[PDB]
Write a protein that binds this ligand. Sequence first.
Ligand SMILES: C[C@H](CCC(=O)O)[C@H]1CC[C@H]2[C@@H]3[C@H](O)C[C@@H]4C[C@H](O)CC[C@]4(C)[C@H]3C[C@H](O)[C@]12C
Ligand SMILES: *C(=O)CCCCCCCCCCCCC
Ligand SMILES: [Zn+2]
Lengths: 127, 88, 12, 128, 62, 56, 81, 459, 122, 220, 71, 171
Amino acid sequence: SGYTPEEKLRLQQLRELRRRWLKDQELSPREPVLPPQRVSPVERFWNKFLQDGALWKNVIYKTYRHSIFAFTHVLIPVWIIHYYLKYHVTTKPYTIVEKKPRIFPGDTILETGEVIPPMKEFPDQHH
Amino acid sequence: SDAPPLTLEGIKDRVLYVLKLYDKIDPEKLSVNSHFMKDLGLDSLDQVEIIMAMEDEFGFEIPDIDAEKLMCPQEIVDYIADKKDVYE
Amino acid sequence: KRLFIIKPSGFY
Amino acid sequence: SFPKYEASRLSSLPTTLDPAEYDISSETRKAQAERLAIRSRLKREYQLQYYDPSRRGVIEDPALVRWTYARSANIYPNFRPNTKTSLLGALFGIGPLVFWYYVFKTDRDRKEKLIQEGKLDRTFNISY
Amino acid sequence: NWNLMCKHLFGFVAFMLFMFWVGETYPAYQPVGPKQYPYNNLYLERGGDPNKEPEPVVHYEI
Amino acid sequence: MNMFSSLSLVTLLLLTMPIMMMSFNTYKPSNYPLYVKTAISYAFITSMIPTMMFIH
Amino acid sequence: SKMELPDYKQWKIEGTPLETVQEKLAARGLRDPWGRNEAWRYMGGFANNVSFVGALLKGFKWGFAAFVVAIGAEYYLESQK
Amino acid sequence: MLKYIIPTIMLMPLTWLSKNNMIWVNSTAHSLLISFTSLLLMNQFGDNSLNFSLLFFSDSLSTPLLILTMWLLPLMLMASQHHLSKENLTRKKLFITMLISLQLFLIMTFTAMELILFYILFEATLVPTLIIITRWGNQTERLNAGLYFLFYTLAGSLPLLVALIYIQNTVGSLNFLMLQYWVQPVHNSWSNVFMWLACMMAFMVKMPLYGLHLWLPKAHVEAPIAGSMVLAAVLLKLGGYGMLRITLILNPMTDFMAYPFIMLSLWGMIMTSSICLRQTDLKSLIAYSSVSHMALVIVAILIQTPWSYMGATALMIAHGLTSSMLFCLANSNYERIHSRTMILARGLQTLLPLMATWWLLASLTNLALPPTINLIGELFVVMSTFSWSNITIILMGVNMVITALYSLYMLIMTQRGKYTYHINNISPSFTRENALMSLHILPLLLLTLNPKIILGPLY
Amino acid sequence: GAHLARRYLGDASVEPDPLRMPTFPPDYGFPERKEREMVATQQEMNDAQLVLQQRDYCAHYLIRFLKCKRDSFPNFLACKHERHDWDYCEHLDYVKRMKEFERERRLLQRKKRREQREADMA
Amino acid sequence: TLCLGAITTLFTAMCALTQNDIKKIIAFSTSSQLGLMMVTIGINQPYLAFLHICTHAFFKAMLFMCSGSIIHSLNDEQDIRKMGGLFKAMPFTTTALIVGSLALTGMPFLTGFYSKDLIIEAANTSYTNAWALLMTLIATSFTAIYSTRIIFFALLGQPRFPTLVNINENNPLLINSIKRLLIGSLFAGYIISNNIPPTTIPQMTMPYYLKTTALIVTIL
Amino acid sequence: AGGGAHIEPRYRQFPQLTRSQVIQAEFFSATMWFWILWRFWHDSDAVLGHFPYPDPSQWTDEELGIPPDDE
Amino acid sequence: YLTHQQKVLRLYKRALRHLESWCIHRDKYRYFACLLRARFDEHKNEKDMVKATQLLREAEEEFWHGQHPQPYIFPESPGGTSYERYECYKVPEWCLDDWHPSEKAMYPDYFAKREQWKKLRRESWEREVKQLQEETPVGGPRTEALPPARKQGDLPPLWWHIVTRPRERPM
Ligand SMILES: C[C@H](CCC(=O)O)[C@H]1CC[C@H]2[C@@H]3[C@H](O)C[C@@H]4C[C@H](O)CC[C@]4(C)[C@H]3C[C@H](O)[C@]12C
Ligand SMILES: *C(=O)CCCCCCCCCCCCC
Ligand SMILES: [Zn+2]
């Protein structure tokens, strides 16, 4: 109900080998040996700028990155979609259809200036 | 996964820390090589509970084919360090 | 502790 | 008290509730040890190629090859045209064909009949 | 036991199916009359032929 | 209407931008999870404008 | 690192539900050796955990305390008109 | 059609007169130009076909098949470069000549205007196809597969020869344009029942019809990769293209003679789809998949409604690229483990990250994931068969479920799980293999943007 | 409800049948009755594009509520009074449908009451 | 459609009463909610079924995130039998977990109240199958059972998780992500309810014992 | 997993907690109860009853057009 | 197979594990667990094996009647939720031999040290083969156990794969 004398021997010999393998899996400080990279000028002005965690500096960077995104992901596409919709899509028949806006008594028609008769007098509710 | 990695000392300290809380072993004589059966007079039925108190500590099951083979609190430490990939 | 990750060759 | 367990092809008998497990005799003891010999012998042949540092390739397994060959290539030469095979081949091969024939043919006969009578609604059917 | 599972599973399914038919033939509702709609029971609103004058239907106040 | 249409489709197009920019690798990795989150964030607020036009 | 485990002599089953279990087992001629191993779950910040009725009422004092203040402003403001 | 026939022939001098080490570069490069020029065949009209001369004509049905035909020969040269590396230089050139000759007969089969000229070229593809299987297969069973392949085809083709000559005697012409205006109804009699069978049986063996398909799991499984691609991609479409043309002169008898064959095809879908669930061999799973996809095409052709014809044309093109792509993917694994067993190599996604993406795209197209052109082709057939009989939706729907199984089962078994421990020669994917898959999927997914060019003459 | 017990446990002839009501003539009582008033006309409800299930006799109140809700935007908490007026007018309608049900309840009890004496006596 | 949903909303709600894995309990909770959505379509209330989709998105998502937060803390231990004593240890996940459960069960004026209670109101006062009506009401009782099962087996009591565990939930991504849904699972239904245009004739008059069926059913 | 404050683990002890963690959780619980109590005060008929439910029995036979038995 | 001494212990372990699932609360578990130990102690030293066997056989049928239908399972054990979760990140070691020369240049220290291991395996193989040829029976191995290293300097036979096995959490 336990290791035989030879069983423990193999385990000890295998076990000590295993740790050395795991030990060898460590990476030296030099590794990884990254090759050269052509770094952008813009990041340089930020890595030096964001060397310190100045609270006021973070906001400028926070607003800077958001503004870039809001321009290249929201403003440019809507120009394209609006240009696509206005001069290629809406110019075709029955391409864009809008549910006719609801009209209520007393309303004023912007197009023709018509006046809708109000509803008949409600006798009384009180409650 | 954000947890602190295990250590050989950490395994040993916790393993003995569980044994120190068992009423059928004297903490005075409890060493790493104190065979559970011959050197402590514990029946196998106790050894089963000893292992069950460990796998509930490290939270990982140990197969019966191997658990019964562990008869020394150093073997438990070696077994876990070998099955958890610890080397230093 | 910055161990080495064994992964297949991704260069190709 | 403890209702007996009743095994099924989709539910094997638990090993703990198997009477043959406890009834151990000399022949049973040797058999298991004799089986382990074969089980152990094959492990040695596999590991002397698996662990070889000069090997690069697939360790061919006769057991796997024999399985594929038995499933496809060896089927026919061991087939005999008897009642067991012939009856099964008839209601599995021709059975479904004749059934579906008298389902689709009947459906279209009734459908064609109504279309001529003019009492089949096809008001907005101009794609076919 | 495999046999026991079939009995309970089919027993549950069949029992539920039976009750839905039982509840179908004996529906529950509220003690109310039909909901009443304006002139001609909305003959024109819901796709009525204008030429075919409908059978007049009139709802009287209680 | 011209505003209702344009802001409705930009919502769908916006979500597809990270997929297109991951096809030609015109971005910097290790910020992609945060890149996707921002697109969803901006997609949400744009979709509100058509929703308000519907509510109104 | 070398984490510091707490003293192993501070785990006593005294005055904890493990104590009551032992008393029942003593009358039956049995003992519960693992009582101290399970003791830490009844000592420290794990002592006297809230009951279900209490949990659903979490934040009631400040929620109600804020409510009374909020309504007080309403009536006082409404008194003006 | 000489602007494509002569260039194809010139590929034969090109291969033989090239340097020893540049036979693949020149044939692969120059055969892609021939493929490029094939796009000029798209000059179709809404009422008339392209009638070049007294022999050759091209319409909206033959045009997509020609473009697919001339597009594969470059891909069949790419696939063959591996297993032919250690081979005699002269033999490495006869193999290329067989591929070039095979394409030569195909581009004239789909354009032949006269049915007897169609028959000869349709029948002449057996020789180069038969030679490829037997000479350059890797197994002992290639010899028996060429016999099954040869005699299944001839046993049905020879009766077709008697029928066409009989038609010419009693009509005066087999020119396809003439038959459109001189076609006469086929009265129901015992004489015609054996002319309808004679005309259709030749093509239904090559589709293949269920029951007569025993040759296909032998030919496709045993042939080399180059043979498998053409056999599954373009050669099966000779049968379907034949029925789409011969059915013109078999009305109104085709309405009741189709019952034995529609029933065989409708039920054969489930039979062959189900076989793929219990297949040990990866290449055989793909071969049986082809029979189940061609079962729909047989059904669509025999019910003769424009939706079925539009869908049928799209299945032929859609299956052509999908089936060939699967064979290349399955072959890539074979070139490493050198075994066709499906379970032998597993967990290959952890070892070949990119090759496992093509498996995903190949499988998703096989199971007709919308809006791919497999779904478009398969949808129109289901829509038209419903109008034929509502009950068919049960069989069409049932086959869809099983198709979703043997496709993703193939993906899971080989690309997921634990890798086989004892297999360690899984070298990365060569640039040749990755480009070979990109040349299948990308054309197949681009056609979703402009599907009308593969919807046949009934569009 | 209790009536379901009466209609399913007990008599059926003295319990209204919802799929059949009304049965007795509208003028059995009420020697003269008034036709329900309809404030909103066909054109009003069509221009406002009310759902066909909303075009009941309470449409005029609903039409006003829609008008106030749109104007109050973005103040979605306004037009509270218009909603209560609309809901209340529906409560009155539901009352009528309940009384209509009862009229069938009591009238049915009459037939069973005046047909036993016409049966036993002769 | 009414009958198909009714059996599911009850059968799946029944399965959750005994599940141990924390995710599977919420998974079955989802099935019961989906069934209730189909019953609403069955009783011809298409918009209320949609209104339950919108509201159900908020708090149902939160419970998974709250559950996922617990699972990571206890090192990928998903069994409620091996949790406990977390009411004080993880106050933010606790508050989020509590708020979600009350939304699910139909606590008044939360996100789930403005859609689930309107559904129960429309079921009773309608020409509906009696058995299907009963299953919806019974299933609502089971909603408060497995919900309490998660609270009782995951927050109260005494710890059952291993000795060395790093119960940390201070990562700002976790708080902010949940803190956005916690707001939603409170006032999401309130805002959408008062803003969507009317499309029906809501049944706002009925017996008292029907108007307060869910409350008594849930509280019981 | 990554980022935010750092809490050293403890052994068989109540885990270390921060100040912000407990304040935020407590505040949201208070908001939940304020919302319920506030809404309940202003909105009670939504959970109790909007309008009285008539009792059919008490309705007189005259208002429902129920004439006498004899006639 | 298993010896009757083993079969009892395994049944004892399962009874506790299923008991823990039923009891849930640790205090309650400690109660019924103690009662169970008593039931297993009253027959600790039974003499007749036939009666001892009948006790095991009857004990099993009681366990099957009361076993938890959904017993607690540890996350990474067969049947656990996290079982085999990370198998997709456990790439083998031979995959490094295919790395492009540029890739190996990024970890010069690792691969240079890896080469030491490869030579260590290559040189000691021919000895390990003999070590098993001599120590095996004439017919062939009768059991799966391997001998340890006897002569100083020799590594245990069949060591490379069990020593270089992928880490349990490679990534
Ligand atoms: C704006 C957003 C988050 C900024 C923040 O909240 O602090 C940041 C996070 C990751 C960034 C993106 C990623 O870096 C990928 C792209 C890289 C280039 O900056 C172009 C846009 C690009 C898509 C970036 C836009 C913007 O700078 C992003 C989207
Ligand atoms: C009645 O309107 C249908 C109610 C169906 C659900 C059961 C609600 C409980 C009703 C009890 C009957 C009490 C009669 C006074
Ligand atoms: Zn090869």
